[PDB]
Design a protein around this ligand. Sequence first.
Ligand SMILES: NC(=O)c1ccc[n+]([C@@H]2O[C@H](COP(=O)([O-])OP(=O)(O)OC[C@H]3O[C@@H](n4cnc5c(N)ncnc54)[C@H](OP(=O)(O)O)[C@@H]3O)[C@@H](O)[C@H]2O)c1
Ligand SMILES: NC(=O)c1ccc[n+]([C@@H]2O[C@H](COP(=O)([O-])OP(=O)(O)OC[C@H]3O[C@@H](n4cnc5c(N)ncnc54)[C@H](OP(=O)(O)O)[C@@H]3O)[C@@H](O)[C@H]2O)c1
Ligand SMILES: [Cl-]
Ligand SMILES: [Cl-]
Ligand SMILES: [Cl-]
Ligand SMILES: [Cl-]
Ligand code: NA
Ligand code: NA
Ligand code: NA
Ligand code: NA
Lengths: 266, 267, 267, 266
Amino acid sequence: SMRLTVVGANGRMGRELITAIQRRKDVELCAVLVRKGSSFVDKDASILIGSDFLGVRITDDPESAFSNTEGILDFSQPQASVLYANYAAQKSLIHIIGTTGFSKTEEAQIADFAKYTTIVKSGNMSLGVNLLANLVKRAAKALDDDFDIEIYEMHHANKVDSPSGTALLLGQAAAEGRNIMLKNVSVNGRSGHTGKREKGTIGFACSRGGTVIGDHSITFAGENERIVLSHIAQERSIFANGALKAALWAKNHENGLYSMLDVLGL
Amino acid sequence: SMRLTVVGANGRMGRELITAIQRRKDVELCAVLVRKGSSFVDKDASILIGSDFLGVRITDDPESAFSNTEGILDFSQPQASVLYANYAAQKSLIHIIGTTGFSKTEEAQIADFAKYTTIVKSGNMSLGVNLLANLVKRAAKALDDDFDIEIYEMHHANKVDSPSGTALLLGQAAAEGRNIMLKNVSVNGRSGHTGKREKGTIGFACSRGGTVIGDHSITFAGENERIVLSHIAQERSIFANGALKAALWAKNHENGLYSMLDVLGLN
Amino acid sequence: SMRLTVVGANGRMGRELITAIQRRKDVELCAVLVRKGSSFVDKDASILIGSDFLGVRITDDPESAFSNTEGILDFSQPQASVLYANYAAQKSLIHIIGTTGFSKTEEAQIADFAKYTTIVKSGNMSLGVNLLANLVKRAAKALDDDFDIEIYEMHHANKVDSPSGTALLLGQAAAEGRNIMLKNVSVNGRSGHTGKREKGTIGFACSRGGTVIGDHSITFAGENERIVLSHIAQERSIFANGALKAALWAKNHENGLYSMLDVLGLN
Amino acid sequence: SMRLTVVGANGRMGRELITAIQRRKDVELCAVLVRKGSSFVDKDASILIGSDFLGVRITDDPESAFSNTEGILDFSQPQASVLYANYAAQKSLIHIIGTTGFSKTEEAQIADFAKYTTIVKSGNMSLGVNLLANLVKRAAKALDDDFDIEIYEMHHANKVDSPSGTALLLGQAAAEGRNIMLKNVSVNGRSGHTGKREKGTIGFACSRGGTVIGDHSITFAGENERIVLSHIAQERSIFANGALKAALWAKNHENGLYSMLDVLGL
Ligand SMILES: NC(=O)c1ccc[n+]([C@@H]2O[C@H](COP(=O)([O-])OP(=O)(O)OC[C@H]3O[C@@H](n4cnc5c(N)ncnc54)[C@H](OP(=O)(O)O)[C@@H]3O)[C@@H](O)[C@H]2O)c1
Ligand SMILES: NC(=O)c1ccc[n+]([C@@H]2O[C@H](COP(=O)([O-])OP(=O)(O)OC[C@H]3O[C@@H](n4cnc5c(N)ncnc54)[C@H](OP(=O)(O)O)[C@@H]3O)[C@@H](O)[C@H]2O)c1
Ligand SMILES: [Cl-]
Ligand SMILES: [Cl-]
Ligand SMILES: [Cl-]
Ligand SMILES: [Cl-]
Ligand code: NA
Ligand code: NA
Ligand code: NA
Ligand code: NA
């Protein structure tokens, strides 16, 4: 049984990770971290998921949360995750990073930390999205830039980052298929533009509303036809279980920065 | 069979109107009017659409164009449309007005002319778009603002306006339903922002690619359910189809100033 | 805060109702009623949903369940619901009835009891599903039958009914709008047929796969345009949310027999 | 310039083929066939597409239509197309068959005729659908039968055959990815069924209405997620131009029965 610590524990994904660890025999909940000053500090982890007593006391202290564990499961917030990757480097812990919305400097620091430990970082832990990204790359290679690539997503009202990490991951697969660089061709929010569409660009549109877990669609819009490739997440458990799969894969793996592709195949 | 005159005939909807009238038995093209000094004056109407000879000689004289007709189909210019509405009042002709850009004074005159004849005036003449707008307004009134309103549209690569005019029309339907002002609550391209969504706002997302004629979708996204209302345009001829419905509905209707909501039976 | 009793509590919507009431401040669980001799009698209501102790002891006595409450939330059985409607009439309690299968006599009695209290009765209690039905009926009336009506739904692999009950409800909305009888115009699975589509029919296509909670889409497909009206369910809790809206709306409303259309403001 | 004859000339696809041949320099309209007793017989082909005089007189006689030509372009009706494939065999003409809805015997006869001439037969002439079929095969191989495959399509009110030929082609790609046989696992119209879904089956749902040129969607519905792959045809010109591309490819090719995959790559 792998011993795992859940950070951002009171968040949507945090609670979902605790629920998933509890229903499985192959992973063990050994610590739960929340922010300093949280009313959950000192309570039993059971309170986060309405379960039976777990015998795991919630802490706000990373030293405590990380003292007797084999891995960190982290869907939280970008500044927090860089901080936890440093702890992961210092203490030689595996770090599963689901968090999205990192800057370039943050990503550079996470790469530094991957020199000292094993880190699986991915903007989507689901099997379906990782297959979709592959299909989008093949599509973007088979269809030349007479087919305009346009990426749409919808998520719940409280999502902080846009485009989603999944959208960016899908855009990067499309850019690879086209042998171009995403940063050179991406256009966020055509809604706030005037002009002819520029050929070869990849557009991003994003809706935010209600409680939607996550829809993503990539349209290839050519002359009198469209190919549309899509993914619909029904619930967050798919990402919780992808993270657990990544933890188990990382356990005795060598140091480095890895993706769900590495975990899955693929 | 209803006799119709198409005005602004070398302009935006003129060819579509003439094409649509030519293929139906229930409407008859009896006149075609163009701007003063047009190359098309004195040519047969067939030259505008590449058909066989139609027996209708294009004119730039409104006196001739309206001399023996039952309705005016008009997607031209505001000042021309006020003039033609006066002809419609004087001669008891129905007037389908798809023109946009009217001043307040011009709108008051059109209201005057509606005392004497039947006028149907709408900036968008698609049966489906006007239906959708009405359903959107109804949904926006029925659902509290714990249902978030997000509006999406997709159009061909070369489209200039963004968001589309139809998106804006749909947005204004939602704002009306919610008793708020579109201009205070609208957010364009959440893609280019960070942070939680602000309550009661209406988002607009726009996609541009390929040759898409026009898709519009309004999502009402609430607690664990969504309602999604969409219009998918296949051909630009839909605006001529609606204009003709409006003409046929207007023919023996009582005088007044009407919209496509009236043509659809939605008041 | 409105005090509510959940009946049929070990049955279909009972747990969802209790869960939904527990997480809100504006409604208070004051009683829980189960069938005579249930294992759950005398247990705390928490045992039904695995929460902490709620201070509400489950009973099988309607006299106790209705002794000090303001409304009855009821997704149980017809004969029980008629009885509870009598309690609601005698005690001036609102009654939200999601029960189905009533006889004509039972429906007449419920109509009697609505002279003395406020009853909201609908076979489906989702705010979004009832809205959608209304918009479908409006669209079916507004668009002539040169717009073809096709109904699609998708549900999880294990779903028994096909087409879904919600699909049938939506179909009946369309039939009403068109002034026709669903049973004469419905076509199930055009997949298993050959030949042109017959005018005025309403088609039903059903997909089964995976864990999908329930997607429904109505297409009105006319000459070169389509209108598409959809409901997407995320969680089964939507039926409890609607039932609670109905309860809150019913509380100080005048007596009568109402539907979710009334709760939504759509008459 | 390749000399081509259009059969089923007054049909939707027939007219579209004539329009496409006329706008191109590399193909030449040399004959136009309609049914016996059609009012179009003896008129100039221009009447079918509202063009300028083409100097091609419409005939109802196959002997005449097929006497001085290099190929037959055929989107018509299954009995008619088997008849024309026989003429194609007898006269050594290439035959591009877009028609769908063939029985097994009809398909067996078309295979016989392919011994004597070159026949490209395909239920969809568009580039997008042939790429989509490939993506569906890869998807169906990457995702095991915990992902339920469900195919949906919508076409105009007057379409005769259901499911569409495109739906069947997509179902066959899915069956190959799953290493199963379509005929063993297909279920048409679940609407008229009661029961649990049977594992490994591929379902087909079809709407018919208005003027829709053709939408197709393949859903892979797993545990708490769906992948959906789709194609939207905007107009019939894409199929007319795919047929012309097939004619040009078939011109000096050896005898046999071929698909748009062969024409395209692919
Ligand atoms: N890769 C994937 O498959 C996947 C799937 C789903 C979501 N995501 C991503 O995962 C992230 C979290 O999503 P979510 O919806 O669960 O967000 P959420 O509900 O907002 O959860 C955020 C959690 O992070 C904690 N946190 C933030 N800053 C912190 C700090 N400085 N120190 C300690 N704790 C801190 C929050 O605590 P407080 O409550 O104290 O603020 C909270 O527990 C997002 O970036 C999202 O895009 C990824
Ligand atoms: N592979 C593709 O990419 C593709 C694309 C589009 C359509 N399709 C398929 O192509 C076929 C035609 O589609 P469509 O919409 O063009 O159909 P349509 O408009 O009904 O055209 C049918 C044509 O076939 C003619 N025809 C039928 N039986 C005949 C006979 N016994 N002898 C002579 N002529 C005969 C008809 O003549 P009358 O008017 O005299 O009956 C008409 O000209 C369908 O099977 C459709 O599924 C394939
Ligand atoms: Cl998220
Ligand atoms: Cl003009
Ligand atoms: Cl019970
Ligand atoms: Cl077809
Ligand atoms: Na465990
Ligand atoms: Na006419
Ligand atoms: Na409560
Ligand atoms: Na040519």
